[PDB]
Amino acid sequence: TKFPKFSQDLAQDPTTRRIWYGIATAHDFETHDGMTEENLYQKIFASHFGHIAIIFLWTSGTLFHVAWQGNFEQWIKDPLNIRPIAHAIWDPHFGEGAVNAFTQAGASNPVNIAYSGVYHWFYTIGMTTNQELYSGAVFLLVLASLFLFAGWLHLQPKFRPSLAWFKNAESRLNHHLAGLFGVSSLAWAGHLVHVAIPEARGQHVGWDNFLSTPPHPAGLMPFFTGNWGVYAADPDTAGHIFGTSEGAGTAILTFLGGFHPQTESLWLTDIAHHHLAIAVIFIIAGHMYRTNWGIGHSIKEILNAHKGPLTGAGHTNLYDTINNSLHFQLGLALASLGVITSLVAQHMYSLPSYAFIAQDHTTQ
Amino acid sequence: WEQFCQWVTSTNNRIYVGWFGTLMIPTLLTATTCFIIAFIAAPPVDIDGIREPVAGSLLYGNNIISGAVVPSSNAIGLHFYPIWEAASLDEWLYNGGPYQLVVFHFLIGIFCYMGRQWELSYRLGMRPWICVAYSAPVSAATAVFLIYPIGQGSFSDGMPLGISGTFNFMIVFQAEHNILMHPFHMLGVAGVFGGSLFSAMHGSLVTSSLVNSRSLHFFLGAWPVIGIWFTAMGVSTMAFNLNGFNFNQSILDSQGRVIGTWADVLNRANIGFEVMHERNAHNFPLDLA
């Protein structure tokens, strides 16, 4: 029997255990027949590309179905009463009672009600019409296509990475800290400043006119002179109505603190200074490890230096242990991700960011 | 000085400038001047690093069709070669550095032309789809003039700035990459064909009436732009030694001998192009006096 090609012990099984254990041990590359370290790493790299592409496709589908069968453009006009719509219902097995029961949210067909709170998220980051949602969905489709092609390409024989390229910890840490974290958060702060806040203050800014209108009446002069306090002057008043110019300030980076009086959420200018400061901190952190210019710390020396008199050897040889083992890295990553996911839940149910999301109790 | 800027941003000038034009005009003028000089009087630019100099200037015995600004030398490789890195002017002239200067200043110029278009469009109070349309030729030019030389690792195999140079570059490209079988050149071909079809149909409809239009014009203008985007991306992919479909010898018999398809003939023609002669064991004259 051919299946499973990656294991010969399972391939000679005459029973149905062959199929079950072929499905079970498919993605455990470390124990396939005739598996090398290089090939293992390259297969992992391609599969990770695949999961990223799947995530982007999932987000695109969420956006597309919300834009197509939702009530976003009516939800924005009354977030406190209208129910967000997730997707339409097409069940041929439905009766008439279910059809009349599920024609909810002021729709004209059986329809679901979104409880993932994506409407609040889209409203908070300045998306006000479903055409923007559609454009985002198409862009996400293109991004997923690009990542799938990237996986395919870096699987090719001449673009196949080496083993040493997969074991360069210093360069990966530097690039992912400064670039993946610092630069991305800086760009997010720029998005909030250039687009999200002006949309919150009843100004429509899109790709067609964002390059013209400056976020602040004094653009880039105080930033280079050093008069930063200008950007924090005249913040939004407590009588500010979200999405309009009534009682709105002109400041973009503030430390107002607390919650918006209307939306019961954190101030967007606070988000801007927060993500910008975080970006700066991460960019400083990303220049820590030496890659090839002499300047920078080396992890092996750090670990071997921090020996203890009570622990015998301290953190000796841990660099080799963590670099050679993939399960060690996966365990560390999973622990960190779980801790910060619990943190995300705890610090989001108590400090809501998206507008009117505290009122909608089911989504919270 | 404020009067100068008021004139620069003025929407009343006979030929608009804008703030992007302040950088567009010098680069375009420089590119045109150096391109004309290189076309007229450039010395024979050796192109492959061997003792076979190639001349592409009018004063060196070329007509209009045969004239072509020769690409850089294989000795240069991909390296940046400005004049000050040349120990004298003659080496820079003989190494194809004019080609690099022309292409760099011209790419800057077309980018600034895009900027000027958008700036005038927004200052005139219009939603700027004109730059969305103009991005397609810019993307194609960048893909075939900058992305491809980098992907191939040298400036030598870039497209010469000449009619015959374009044909030679295209044929060598087909030989080395099989662009025709690549889906993205077909996407570009479909885009340009649809553009021509829509042009003819729309002109006939308007002229026949001479005395859904919104989305009609939208898709009319959108089809060729998407096609050109796709073919530019295809060329950029081909730069890093990616090729079209290879359906050759993909059909066998019960025993194992290839049957052969039209794709096999395409592959044979490509191999014939990439070596401009016959194959082995074709009875060379055994004895010569």
Binding site: L220 | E2, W19, F20, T22, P26, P82, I83, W84
Partner: peptide
């Protein structure tokens, strides 16, 4: 090397003028 310096100052002044004008857009 004088040509290199001249080109450097020329391009630097051009880009500086463009960015300075763009940040103080009168209209």
């Amino acid at each position: 090397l004088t040509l290199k310096i001249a080109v450097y100052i020329v391009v630097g002044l051009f880009i500086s003028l463009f960015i300075f004008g763009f940040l103080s857009s009168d209209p």
